[PDB]
């Protein structure tokens, strides 16, 4: 019974670690996706300005 | 950037505007050489009339 309690404690520790890392990954994931959205926006717009060079 | 778009627009359009005022001025200049041409034609015809006047006299 004592060994079962120790193993259960360690398993619960690991599982809480799992959940916390998953939440951190979620936050990072959202930030990276928004970053790339605005990156592609600014890149397209620099290209549009270059198109302006073509129109000139 | 959108700001860049507007910048090139105002600058290029003012450039075309200035060139176009240049050519409208040049059109007025052309009409001015025209007026000068008719005035010189009238002056030469008047000189011919005066010389014929003196000869008739």
UniProtKB/Swiss-Prot annotation, chain A:
Changing residue 55 to A: Loss of phosphorylation and decreased formation of actin stress fibers. The modification Phosphotyrosine is found at residue 33. Phosphorylated at Ser-55 by DAPK1 in response to oxidative stress and this phosphorylation enhances stress fiber formation in endothelial cells. Detected in primary breast cancer tissues but undetectable in normal breast tissues in Sudanese patients. Isoform 1 is expressed in adult and fetal skeletal muscle and cardiac tissues, with higher expression levels in the cardiac tissues. Isoform 10 is expressed in adult and fetal cardiac tissues, but not in skeletal muscle. It is found in: Cytoplasm, Cytoskeleton. Homodimer. Heterodimer of an alpha (TPM1, TPM3 or TPM4) and a beta (TPM2) chain. Interacts with HRG (via the HRR domain); the interaction contributes to the antiangiogenic properties of the histidine/proline-rich region (HRR) of HRG. Interacts (via N-terminus) with LMOD2 (via N-terminus) and TMOD1 (via N-terminus). The molecule is in a coiled coil structure that is formed by 2 polypeptide chains. The sequence exhibits a prominent seven-residues periodicity. Belongs to the tropomyosin family. This is Tropomyosin alpha-1 chain. The gene is TPM1. The chain holds residues 229 to 284 of 284 of the full protein.
